[PDB]
JSON list of C-alpha atoms in Angstrom, two decimals:
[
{"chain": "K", "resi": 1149, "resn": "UNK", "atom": "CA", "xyz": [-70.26, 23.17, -96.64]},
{"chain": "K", "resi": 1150, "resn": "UNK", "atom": "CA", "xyz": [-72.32, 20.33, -98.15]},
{"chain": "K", "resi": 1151, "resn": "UNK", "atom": "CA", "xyz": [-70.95, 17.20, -98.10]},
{"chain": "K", "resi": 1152, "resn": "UNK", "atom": "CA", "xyz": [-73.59, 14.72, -99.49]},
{"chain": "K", "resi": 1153, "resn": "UNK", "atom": "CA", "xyz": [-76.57, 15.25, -101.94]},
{"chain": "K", "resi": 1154, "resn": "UNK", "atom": "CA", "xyz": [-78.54, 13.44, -99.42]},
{"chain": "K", "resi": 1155, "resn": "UNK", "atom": "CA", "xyz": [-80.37, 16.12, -97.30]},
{"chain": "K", "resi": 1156, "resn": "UNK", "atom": "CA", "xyz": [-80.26, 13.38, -93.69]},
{"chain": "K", "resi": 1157, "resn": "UNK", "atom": "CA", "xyz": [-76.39, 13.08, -94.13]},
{"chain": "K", "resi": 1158, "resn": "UNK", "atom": "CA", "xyz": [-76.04, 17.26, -94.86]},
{"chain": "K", "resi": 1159, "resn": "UNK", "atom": "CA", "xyz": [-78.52, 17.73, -91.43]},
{"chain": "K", "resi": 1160, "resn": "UNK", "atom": "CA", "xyz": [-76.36, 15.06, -89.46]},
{"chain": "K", "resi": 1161, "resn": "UNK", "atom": "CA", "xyz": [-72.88, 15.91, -90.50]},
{"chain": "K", "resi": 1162, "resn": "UNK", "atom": "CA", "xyz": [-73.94, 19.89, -89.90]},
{"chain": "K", "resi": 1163, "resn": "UNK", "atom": "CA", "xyz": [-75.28, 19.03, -86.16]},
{"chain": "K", "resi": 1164, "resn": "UNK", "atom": "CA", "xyz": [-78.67, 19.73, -87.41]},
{"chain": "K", "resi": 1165, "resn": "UNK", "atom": "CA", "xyz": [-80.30, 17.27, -84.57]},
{"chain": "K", "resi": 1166, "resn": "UNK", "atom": "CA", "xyz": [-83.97, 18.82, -84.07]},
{"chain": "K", "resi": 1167, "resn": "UNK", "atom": "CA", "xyz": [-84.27, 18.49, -87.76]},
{"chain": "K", "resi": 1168, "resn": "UNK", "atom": "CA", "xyz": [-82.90, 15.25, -88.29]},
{"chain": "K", "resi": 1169, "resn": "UNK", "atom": "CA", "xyz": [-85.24, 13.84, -85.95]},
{"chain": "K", "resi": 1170, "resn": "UNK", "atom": "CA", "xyz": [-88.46, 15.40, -87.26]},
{"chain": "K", "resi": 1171, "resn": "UNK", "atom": "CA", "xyz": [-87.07, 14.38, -90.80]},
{"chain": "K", "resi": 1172, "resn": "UNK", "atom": "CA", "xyz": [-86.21, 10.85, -90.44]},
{"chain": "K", "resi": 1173, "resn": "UNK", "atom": "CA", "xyz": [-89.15, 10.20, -87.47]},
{"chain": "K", "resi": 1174, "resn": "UNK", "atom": "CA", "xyz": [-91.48, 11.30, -90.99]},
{"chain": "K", "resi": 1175, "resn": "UNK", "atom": "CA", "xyz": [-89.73, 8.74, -92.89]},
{"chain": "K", "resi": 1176, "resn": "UNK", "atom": "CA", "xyz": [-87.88, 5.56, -91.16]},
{"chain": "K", "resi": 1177, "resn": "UNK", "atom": "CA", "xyz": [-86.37, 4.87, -94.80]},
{"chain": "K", "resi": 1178, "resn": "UNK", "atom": "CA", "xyz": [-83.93, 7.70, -94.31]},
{"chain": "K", "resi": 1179, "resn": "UNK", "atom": "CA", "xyz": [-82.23, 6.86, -91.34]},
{"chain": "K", "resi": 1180, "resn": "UNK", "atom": "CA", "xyz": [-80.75, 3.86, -94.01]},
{"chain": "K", "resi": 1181, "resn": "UNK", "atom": "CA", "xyz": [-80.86, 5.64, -97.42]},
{"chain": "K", "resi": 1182, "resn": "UNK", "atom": "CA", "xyz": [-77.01, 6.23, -99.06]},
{"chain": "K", "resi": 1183, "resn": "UNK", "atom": "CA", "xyz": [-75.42, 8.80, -100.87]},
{"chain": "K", "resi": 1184, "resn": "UNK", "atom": "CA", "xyz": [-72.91, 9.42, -103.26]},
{"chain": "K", "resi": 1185, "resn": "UNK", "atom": "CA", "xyz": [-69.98, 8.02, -100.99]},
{"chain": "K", "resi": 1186, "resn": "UNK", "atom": "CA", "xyz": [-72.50, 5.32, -100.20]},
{"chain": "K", "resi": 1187, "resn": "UNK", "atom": "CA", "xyz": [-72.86, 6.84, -96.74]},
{"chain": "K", "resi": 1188, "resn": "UNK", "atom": "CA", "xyz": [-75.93, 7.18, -94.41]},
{"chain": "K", "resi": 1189, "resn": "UNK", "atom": "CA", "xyz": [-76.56, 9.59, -91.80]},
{"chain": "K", "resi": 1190, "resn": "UNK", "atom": "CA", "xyz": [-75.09, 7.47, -89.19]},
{"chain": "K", "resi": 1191, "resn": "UNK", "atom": "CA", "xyz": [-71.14, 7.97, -91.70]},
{"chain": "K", "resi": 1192, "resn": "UNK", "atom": "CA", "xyz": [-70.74, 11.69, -91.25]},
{"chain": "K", "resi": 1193, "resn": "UNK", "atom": "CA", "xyz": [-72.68, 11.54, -87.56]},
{"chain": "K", "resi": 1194, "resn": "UNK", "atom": "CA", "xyz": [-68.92, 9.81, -86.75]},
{"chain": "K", "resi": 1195, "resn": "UNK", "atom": "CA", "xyz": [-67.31, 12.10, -88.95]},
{"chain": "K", "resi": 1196, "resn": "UNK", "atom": "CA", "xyz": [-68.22, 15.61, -87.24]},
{"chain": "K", "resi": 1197, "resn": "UNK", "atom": "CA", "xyz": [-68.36, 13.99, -83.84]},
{"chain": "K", "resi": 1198, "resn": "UNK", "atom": "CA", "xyz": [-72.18, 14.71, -83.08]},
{"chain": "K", "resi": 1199, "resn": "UNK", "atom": "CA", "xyz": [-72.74, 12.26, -80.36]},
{"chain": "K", "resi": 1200, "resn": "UNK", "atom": "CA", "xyz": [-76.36, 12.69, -79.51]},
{"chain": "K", "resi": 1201, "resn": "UNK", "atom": "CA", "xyz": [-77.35, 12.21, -83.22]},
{"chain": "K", "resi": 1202, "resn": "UNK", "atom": "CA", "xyz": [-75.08, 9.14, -83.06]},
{"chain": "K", "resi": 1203, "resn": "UNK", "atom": "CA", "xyz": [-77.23, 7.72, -79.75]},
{"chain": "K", "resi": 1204, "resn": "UNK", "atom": "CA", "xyz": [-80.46, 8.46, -81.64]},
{"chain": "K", "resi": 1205, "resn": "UNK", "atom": "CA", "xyz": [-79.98, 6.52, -84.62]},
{"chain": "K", "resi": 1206, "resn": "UNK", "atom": "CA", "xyz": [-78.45, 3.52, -82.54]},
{"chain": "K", "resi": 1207, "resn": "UNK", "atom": "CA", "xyz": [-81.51, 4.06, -80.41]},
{"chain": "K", "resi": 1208, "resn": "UNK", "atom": "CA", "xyz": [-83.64, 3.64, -83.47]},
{"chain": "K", "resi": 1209, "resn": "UNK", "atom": "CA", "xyz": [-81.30, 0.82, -84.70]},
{"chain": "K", "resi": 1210, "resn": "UNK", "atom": "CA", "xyz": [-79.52, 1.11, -88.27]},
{"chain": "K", "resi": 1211, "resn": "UNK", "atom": "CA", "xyz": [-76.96, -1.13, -88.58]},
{"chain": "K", "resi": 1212, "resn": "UNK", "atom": "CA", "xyz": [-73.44, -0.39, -87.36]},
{"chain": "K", "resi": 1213, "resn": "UNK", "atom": "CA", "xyz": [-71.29, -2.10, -89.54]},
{"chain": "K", "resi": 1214, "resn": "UNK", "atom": "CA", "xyz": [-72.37, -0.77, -92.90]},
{"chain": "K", "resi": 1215, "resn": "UNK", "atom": "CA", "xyz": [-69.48, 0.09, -94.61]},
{"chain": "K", "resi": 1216, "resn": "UNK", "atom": "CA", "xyz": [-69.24, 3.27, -97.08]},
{"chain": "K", "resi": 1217, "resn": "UNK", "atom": "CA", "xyz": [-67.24, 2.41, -100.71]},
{"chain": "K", "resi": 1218, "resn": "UNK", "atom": "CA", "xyz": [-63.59, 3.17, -99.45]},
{"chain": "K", "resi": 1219, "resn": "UNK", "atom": "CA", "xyz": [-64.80, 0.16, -96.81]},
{"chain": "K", "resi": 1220, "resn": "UNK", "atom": "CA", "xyz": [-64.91, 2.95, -93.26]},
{"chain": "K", "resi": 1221, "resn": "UNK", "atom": "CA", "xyz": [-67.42, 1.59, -90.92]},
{"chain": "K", "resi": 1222, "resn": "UNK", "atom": "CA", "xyz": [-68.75, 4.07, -88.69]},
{"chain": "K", "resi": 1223, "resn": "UNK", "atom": "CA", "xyz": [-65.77, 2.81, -86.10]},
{"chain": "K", "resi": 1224, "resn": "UNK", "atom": "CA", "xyz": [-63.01, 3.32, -88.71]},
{"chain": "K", "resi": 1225, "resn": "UNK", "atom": "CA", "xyz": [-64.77, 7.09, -88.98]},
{"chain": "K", "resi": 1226, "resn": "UNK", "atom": "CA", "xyz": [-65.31, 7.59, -84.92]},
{"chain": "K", "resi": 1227, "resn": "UNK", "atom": "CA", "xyz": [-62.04, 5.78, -84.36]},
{"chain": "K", "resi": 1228, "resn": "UNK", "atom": "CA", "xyz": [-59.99, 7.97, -86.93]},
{"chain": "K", "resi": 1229, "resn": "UNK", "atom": "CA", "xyz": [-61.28, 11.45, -86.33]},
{"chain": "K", "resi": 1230, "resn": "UNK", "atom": "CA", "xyz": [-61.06, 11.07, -82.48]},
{"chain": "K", "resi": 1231, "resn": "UNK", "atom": "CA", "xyz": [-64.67, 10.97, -81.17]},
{"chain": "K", "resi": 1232, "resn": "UNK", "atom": "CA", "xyz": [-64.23, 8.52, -78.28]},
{"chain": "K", "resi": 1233, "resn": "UNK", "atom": "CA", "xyz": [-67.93, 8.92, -76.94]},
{"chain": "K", "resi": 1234, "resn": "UNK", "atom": "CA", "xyz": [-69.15, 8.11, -80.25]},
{"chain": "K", "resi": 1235, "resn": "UNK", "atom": "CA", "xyz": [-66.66, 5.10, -80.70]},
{"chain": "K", "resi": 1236, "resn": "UNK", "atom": "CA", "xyz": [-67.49, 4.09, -76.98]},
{"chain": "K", "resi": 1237, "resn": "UNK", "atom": "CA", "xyz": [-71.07, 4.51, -78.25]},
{"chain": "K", "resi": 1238, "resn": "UNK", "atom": "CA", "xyz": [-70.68, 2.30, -81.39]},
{"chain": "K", "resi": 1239, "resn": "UNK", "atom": "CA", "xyz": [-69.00, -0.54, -79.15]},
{"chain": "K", "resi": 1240, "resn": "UNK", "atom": "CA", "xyz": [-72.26, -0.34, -76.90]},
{"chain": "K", "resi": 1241, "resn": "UNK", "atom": "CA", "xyz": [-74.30, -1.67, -79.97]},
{"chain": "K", "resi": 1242, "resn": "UNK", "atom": "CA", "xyz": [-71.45, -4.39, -80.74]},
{"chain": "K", "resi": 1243, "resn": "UNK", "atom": "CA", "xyz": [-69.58, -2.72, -83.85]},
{"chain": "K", "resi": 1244, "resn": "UNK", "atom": "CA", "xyz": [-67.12, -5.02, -85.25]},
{"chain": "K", "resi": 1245, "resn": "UNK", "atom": "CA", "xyz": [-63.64, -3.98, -83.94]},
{"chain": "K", "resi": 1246, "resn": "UNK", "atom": "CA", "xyz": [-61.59, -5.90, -86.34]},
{"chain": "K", "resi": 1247, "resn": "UNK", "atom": "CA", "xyz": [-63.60, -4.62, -89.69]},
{"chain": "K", "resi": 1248, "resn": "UNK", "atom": "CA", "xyz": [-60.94, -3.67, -92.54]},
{"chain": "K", "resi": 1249, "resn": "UNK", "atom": "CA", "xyz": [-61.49, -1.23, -95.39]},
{"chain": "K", "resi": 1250, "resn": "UNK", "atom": "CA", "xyz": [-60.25, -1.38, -98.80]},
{"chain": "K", "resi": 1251, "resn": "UNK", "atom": "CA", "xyz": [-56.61, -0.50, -97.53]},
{"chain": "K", "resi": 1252, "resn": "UNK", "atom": "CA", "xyz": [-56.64, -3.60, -95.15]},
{"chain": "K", "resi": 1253, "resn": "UNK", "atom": "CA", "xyz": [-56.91, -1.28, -92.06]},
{"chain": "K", "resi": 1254, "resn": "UNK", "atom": "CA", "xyz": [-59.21, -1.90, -88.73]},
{"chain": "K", "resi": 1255, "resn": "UNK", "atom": "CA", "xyz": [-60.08, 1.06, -86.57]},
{"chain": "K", "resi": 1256, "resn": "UNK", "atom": "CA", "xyz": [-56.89, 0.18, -83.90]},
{"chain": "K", "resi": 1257, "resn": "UNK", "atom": "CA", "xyz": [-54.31, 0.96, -87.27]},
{"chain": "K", "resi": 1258, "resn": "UNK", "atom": "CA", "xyz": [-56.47, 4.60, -87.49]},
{"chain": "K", "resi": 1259, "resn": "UNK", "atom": "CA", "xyz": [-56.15, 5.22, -83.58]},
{"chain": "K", "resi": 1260, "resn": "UNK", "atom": "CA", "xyz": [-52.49, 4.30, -83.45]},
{"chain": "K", "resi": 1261, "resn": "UNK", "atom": "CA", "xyz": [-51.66, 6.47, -86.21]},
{"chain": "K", "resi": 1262, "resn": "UNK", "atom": "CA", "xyz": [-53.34, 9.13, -84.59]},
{"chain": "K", "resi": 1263, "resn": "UNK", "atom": "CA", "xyz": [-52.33, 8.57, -81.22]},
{"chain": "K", "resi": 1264, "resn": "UNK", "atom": "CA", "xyz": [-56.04, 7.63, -80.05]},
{"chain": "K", "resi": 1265, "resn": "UNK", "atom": "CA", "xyz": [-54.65, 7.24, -76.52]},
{"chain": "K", "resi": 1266, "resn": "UNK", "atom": "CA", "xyz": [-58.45, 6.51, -74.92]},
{"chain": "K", "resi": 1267, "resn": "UNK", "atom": "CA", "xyz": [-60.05, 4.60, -78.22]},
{"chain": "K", "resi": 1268, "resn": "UNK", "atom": "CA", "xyz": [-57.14, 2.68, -79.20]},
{"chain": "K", "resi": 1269, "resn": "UNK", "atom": "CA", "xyz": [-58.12, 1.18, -75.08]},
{"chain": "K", "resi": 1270, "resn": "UNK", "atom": "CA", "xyz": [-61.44, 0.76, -76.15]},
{"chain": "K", "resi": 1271, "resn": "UNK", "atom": "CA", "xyz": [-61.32, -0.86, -79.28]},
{"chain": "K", "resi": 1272, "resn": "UNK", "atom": "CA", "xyz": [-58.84, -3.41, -77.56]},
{"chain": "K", "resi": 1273, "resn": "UNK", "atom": "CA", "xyz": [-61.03, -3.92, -74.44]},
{"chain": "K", "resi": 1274, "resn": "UNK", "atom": "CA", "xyz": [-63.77, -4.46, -77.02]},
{"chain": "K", "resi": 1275, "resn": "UNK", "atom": "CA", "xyz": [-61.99, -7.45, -78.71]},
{"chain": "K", "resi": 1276, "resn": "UNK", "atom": "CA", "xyz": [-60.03, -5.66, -81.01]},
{"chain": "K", "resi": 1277, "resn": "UNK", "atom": "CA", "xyz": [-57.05, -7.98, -82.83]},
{"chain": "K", "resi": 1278, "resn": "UNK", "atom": "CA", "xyz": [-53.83, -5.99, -81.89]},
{"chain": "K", "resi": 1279, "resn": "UNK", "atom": "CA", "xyz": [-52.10, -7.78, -84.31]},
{"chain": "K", "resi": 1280, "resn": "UNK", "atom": "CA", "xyz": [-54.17, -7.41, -87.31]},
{"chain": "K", "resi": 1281, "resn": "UNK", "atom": "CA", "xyz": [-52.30, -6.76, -90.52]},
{"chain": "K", "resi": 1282, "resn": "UNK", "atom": "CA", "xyz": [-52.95, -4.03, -93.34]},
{"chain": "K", "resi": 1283, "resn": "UNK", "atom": "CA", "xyz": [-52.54, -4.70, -97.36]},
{"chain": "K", "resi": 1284, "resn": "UNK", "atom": "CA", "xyz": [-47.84, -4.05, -96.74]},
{"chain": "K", "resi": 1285, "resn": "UNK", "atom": "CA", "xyz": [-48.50, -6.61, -93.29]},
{"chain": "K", "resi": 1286, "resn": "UNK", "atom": "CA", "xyz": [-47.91, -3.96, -91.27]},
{"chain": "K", "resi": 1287, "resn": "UNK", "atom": "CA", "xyz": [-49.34, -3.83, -87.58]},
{"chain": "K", "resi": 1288, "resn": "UNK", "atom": "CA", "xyz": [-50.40, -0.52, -85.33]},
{"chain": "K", "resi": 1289, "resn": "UNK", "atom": "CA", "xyz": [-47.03, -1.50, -83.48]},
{"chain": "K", "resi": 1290, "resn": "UNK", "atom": "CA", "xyz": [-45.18, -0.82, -86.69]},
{"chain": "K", "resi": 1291, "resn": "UNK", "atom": "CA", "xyz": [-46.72, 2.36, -86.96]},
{"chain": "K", "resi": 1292, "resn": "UNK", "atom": "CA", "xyz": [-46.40, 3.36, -83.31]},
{"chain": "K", "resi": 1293, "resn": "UNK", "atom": "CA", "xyz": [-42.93, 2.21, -83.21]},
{"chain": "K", "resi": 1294, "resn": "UNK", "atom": "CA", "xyz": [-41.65, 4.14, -86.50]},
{"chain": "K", "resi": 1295, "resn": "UNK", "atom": "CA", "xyz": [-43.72, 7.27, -85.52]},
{"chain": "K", "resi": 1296, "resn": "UNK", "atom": "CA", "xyz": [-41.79, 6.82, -81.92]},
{"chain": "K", "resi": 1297, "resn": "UNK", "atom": "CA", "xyz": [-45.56, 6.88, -79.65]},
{"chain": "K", "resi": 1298, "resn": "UNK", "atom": "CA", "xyz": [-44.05, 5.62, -76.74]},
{"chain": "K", "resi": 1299, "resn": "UNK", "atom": "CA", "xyz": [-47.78, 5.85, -75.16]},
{"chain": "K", "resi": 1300, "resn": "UNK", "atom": "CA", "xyz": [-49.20, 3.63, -77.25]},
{"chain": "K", "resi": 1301, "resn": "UNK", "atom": "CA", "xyz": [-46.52, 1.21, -77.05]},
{"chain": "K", "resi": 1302, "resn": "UNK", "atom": "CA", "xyz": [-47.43, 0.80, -73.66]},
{"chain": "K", "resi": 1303, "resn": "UNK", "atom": "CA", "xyz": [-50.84, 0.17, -74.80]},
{"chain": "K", "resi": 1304, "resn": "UNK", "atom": "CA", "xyz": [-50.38, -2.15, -77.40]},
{"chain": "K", "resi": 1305, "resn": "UNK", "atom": "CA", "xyz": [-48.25, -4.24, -75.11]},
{"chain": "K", "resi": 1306, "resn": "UNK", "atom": "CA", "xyz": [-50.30, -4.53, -71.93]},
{"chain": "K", "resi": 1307, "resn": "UNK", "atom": "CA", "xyz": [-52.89, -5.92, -74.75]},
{"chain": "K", "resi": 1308, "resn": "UNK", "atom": "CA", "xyz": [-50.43, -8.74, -75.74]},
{"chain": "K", "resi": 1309, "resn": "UNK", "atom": "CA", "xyz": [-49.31, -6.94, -79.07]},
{"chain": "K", "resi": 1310, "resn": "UNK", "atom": "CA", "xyz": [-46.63, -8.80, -81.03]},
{"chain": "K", "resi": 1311, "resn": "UNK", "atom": "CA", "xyz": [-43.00, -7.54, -81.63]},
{"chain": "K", "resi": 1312, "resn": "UNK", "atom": "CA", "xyz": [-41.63, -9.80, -84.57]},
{"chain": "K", "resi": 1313, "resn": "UNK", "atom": "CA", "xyz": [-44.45, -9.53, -87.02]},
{"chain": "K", "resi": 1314, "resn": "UNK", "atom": "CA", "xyz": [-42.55, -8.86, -90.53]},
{"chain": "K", "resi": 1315, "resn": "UNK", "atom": "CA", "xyz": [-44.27, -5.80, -93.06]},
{"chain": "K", "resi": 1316, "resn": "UNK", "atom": "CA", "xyz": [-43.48, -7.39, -96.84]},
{"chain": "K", "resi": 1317, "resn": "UNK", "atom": "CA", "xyz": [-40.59, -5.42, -96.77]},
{"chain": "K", "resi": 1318, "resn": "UNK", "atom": "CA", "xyz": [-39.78, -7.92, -94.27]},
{"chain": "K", "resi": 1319, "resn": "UNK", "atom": "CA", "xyz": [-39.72, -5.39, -90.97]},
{"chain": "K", "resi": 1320, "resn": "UNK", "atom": "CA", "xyz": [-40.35, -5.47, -87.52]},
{"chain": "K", "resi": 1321, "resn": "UNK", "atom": "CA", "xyz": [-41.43, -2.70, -85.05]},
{"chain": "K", "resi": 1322, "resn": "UNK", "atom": "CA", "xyz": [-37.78, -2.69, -83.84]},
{"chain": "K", "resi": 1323, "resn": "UNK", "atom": "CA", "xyz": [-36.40, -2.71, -87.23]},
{"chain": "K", "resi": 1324, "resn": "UNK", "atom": "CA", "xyz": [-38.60, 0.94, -87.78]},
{"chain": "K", "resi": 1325, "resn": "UNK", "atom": "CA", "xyz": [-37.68, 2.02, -84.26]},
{"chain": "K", "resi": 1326, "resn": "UNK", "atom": "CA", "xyz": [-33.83, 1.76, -84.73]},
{"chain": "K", "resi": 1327, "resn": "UNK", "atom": "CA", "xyz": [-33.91, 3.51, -88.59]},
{"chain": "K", "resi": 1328, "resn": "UNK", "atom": "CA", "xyz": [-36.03, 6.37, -87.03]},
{"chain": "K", "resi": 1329, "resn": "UNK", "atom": "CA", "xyz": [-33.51, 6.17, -84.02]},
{"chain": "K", "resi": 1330, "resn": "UNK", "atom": "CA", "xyz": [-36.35, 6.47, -81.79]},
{"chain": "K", "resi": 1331, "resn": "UNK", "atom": "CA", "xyz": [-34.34, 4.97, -78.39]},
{"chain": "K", "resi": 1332, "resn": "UNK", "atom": "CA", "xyz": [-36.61, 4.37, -75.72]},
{"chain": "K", "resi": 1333, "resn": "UNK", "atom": "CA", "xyz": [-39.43, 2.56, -78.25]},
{"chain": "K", "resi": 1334, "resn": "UNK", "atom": "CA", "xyz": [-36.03, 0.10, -79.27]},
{"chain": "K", "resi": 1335, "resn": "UNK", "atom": "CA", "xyz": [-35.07, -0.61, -75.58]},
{"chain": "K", "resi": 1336, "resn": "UNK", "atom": "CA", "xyz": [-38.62, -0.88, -74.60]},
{"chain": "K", "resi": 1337, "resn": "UNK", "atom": "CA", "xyz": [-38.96, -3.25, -77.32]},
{"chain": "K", "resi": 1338, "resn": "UNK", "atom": "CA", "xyz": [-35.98, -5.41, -76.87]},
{"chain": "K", "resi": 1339, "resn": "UNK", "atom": "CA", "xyz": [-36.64, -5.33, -73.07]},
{"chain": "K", "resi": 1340, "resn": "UNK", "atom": "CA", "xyz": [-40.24, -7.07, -74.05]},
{"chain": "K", "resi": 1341, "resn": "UNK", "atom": "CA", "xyz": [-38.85, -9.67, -76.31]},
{"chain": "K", "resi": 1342, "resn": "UNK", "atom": "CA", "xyz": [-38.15, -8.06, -79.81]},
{"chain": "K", "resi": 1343, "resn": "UNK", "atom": "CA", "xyz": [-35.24, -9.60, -81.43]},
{"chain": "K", "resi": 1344, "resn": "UNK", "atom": "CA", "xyz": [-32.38, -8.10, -82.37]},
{"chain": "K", "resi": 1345, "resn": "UNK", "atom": "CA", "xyz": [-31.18, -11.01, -85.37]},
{"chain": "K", "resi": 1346, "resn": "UNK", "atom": "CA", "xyz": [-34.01, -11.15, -87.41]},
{"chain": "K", "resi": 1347, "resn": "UNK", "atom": "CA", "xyz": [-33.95, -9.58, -90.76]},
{"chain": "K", "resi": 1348, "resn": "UNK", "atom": "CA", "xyz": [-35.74, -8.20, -93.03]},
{"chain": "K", "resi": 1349, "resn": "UNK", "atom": "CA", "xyz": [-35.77, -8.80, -97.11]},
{"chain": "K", "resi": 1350, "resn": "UNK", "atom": "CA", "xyz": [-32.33, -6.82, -97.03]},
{"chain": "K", "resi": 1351, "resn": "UNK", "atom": "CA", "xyz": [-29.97, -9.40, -95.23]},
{"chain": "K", "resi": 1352, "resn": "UNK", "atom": "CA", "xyz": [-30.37, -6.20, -92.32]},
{"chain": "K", "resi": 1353, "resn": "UNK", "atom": "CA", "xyz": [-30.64, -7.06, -88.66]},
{"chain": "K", "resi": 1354, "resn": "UNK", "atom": "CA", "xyz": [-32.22, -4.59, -86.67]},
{"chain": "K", "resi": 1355, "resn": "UNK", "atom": "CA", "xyz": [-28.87, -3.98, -84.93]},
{"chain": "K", "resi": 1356, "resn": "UNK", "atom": "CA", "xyz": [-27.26, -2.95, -88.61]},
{"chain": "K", "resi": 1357, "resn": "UNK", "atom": "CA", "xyz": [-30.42, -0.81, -89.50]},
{"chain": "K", "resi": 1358, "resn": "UNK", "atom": "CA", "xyz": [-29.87, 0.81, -86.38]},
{"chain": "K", "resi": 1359, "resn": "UNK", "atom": "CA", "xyz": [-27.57, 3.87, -85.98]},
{"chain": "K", "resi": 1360, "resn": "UNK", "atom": "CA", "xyz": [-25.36, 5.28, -83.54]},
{"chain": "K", "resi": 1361, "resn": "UNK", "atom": "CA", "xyz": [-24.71, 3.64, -80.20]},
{"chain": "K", "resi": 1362, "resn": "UNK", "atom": "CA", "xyz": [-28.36, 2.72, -80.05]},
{"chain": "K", "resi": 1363, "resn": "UNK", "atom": "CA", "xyz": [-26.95, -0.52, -82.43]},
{"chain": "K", "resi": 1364, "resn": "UNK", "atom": "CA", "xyz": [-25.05, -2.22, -80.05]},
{"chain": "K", "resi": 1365, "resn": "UNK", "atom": "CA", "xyz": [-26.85, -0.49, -76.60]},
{"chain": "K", "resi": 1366, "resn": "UNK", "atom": "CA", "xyz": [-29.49, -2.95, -77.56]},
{"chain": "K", "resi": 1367, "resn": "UNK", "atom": "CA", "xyz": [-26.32, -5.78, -77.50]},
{"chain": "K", "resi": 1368, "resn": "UNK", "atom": "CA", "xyz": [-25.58, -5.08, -74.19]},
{"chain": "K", "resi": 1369, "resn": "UNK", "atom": "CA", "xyz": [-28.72, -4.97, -73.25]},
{"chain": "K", "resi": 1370, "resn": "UNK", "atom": "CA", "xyz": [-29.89, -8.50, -74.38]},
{"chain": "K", "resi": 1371, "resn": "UNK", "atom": "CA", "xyz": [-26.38, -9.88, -74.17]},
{"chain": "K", "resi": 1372, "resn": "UNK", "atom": "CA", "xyz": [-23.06, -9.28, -72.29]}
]
């Protein structure tokens, strides 16, 4: 299907390599020209997952940072739709990890979501901010936690994630973890040092938000 009146981003999102290159190798200018979504060749590149037509227009060297008018940078794209060679690629020419779109999310809040085991690594070897907040202040640990990606817990805490950061509705990870009763993600939690008295803009410790014996199983675990 055609996703772009602009013939370099059709060829490019299609896997149309041979093509591209004779096209854009006959005119530099389109390796950089936008289209409707204000998106160059290098945009939907990310967004099928074409790798080697990725490497050749970092090898010819557009920018990597150019954001389209929702604010995705070729890493939110790569990040989001799981391409890790083409994220790993994108690194390799020093894409900025901690971009945000126009919904205040990096790339790390689009591979949490998405359980992006391998990029959500990358992007926080890379220099990635684990901690980075959206537009509601919410965190990929927030997601991960509510969600219940135990995986990526892991992750986000080897890489010296946070566990009291507060959404506006004045959450934490833990708070999300015990009202989605997810029970490992809350003792993992509380065994790394999130708190069980804080509350959030409804008077609510994560203990009360929490349901069944999970409530107070965190209580004897911190206490007793």
């Amino acid at each position: 299907g055609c996703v772009s009146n602009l013939m370099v981003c059709n060829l490019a999102y299609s896997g149309k390599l041979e093509e591209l290159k004779e096209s854009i190798l006959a005119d530099k200018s389109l390796a950089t020209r936008t289209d409707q979504d204000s998106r160059t060749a290098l945009h939907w590149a990310c967004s099928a997952g074409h790798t080697e037509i990725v490497e050749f227009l970092l090898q010819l060297g557009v920018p990597v940072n150019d954001k389209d008018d929702a604010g995705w940078s070729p890493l939110h794209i790569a990040a989001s739709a799981g391409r890790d060679e083409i994220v790993k690629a994108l690194l390799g020419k020093g894409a900025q990890v901690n971009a945000v779109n126009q919904n205040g999310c990096t790339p790390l809040h689009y591979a949490a979501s998405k359980n992006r085991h391998e990029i959500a690594v990358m992007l926080l070897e890379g220099g990635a901010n684990p901690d980075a907040k959206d537009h509601y202040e919410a965190t990929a640990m927030h997601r991960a936690a509510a969600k219940g990606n135990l995986k990526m817990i892991h992750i986000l805490l080897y890489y010296k994630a946070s566990t009291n950061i507060q959404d506006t509705e004045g959450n934490t990870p833990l708070h999300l973890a015990c009202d989605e009763e997810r029970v490992e993600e809350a003792k993992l939690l509380v065994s790394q040092g999130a708190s069980i008295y804080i509350e959030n803009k409804e008077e609510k410790t994560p203990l009360q938000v929490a349901k069944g014996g999970l409530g107070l199983i965190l209580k004897r675990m911190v206490e007793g």
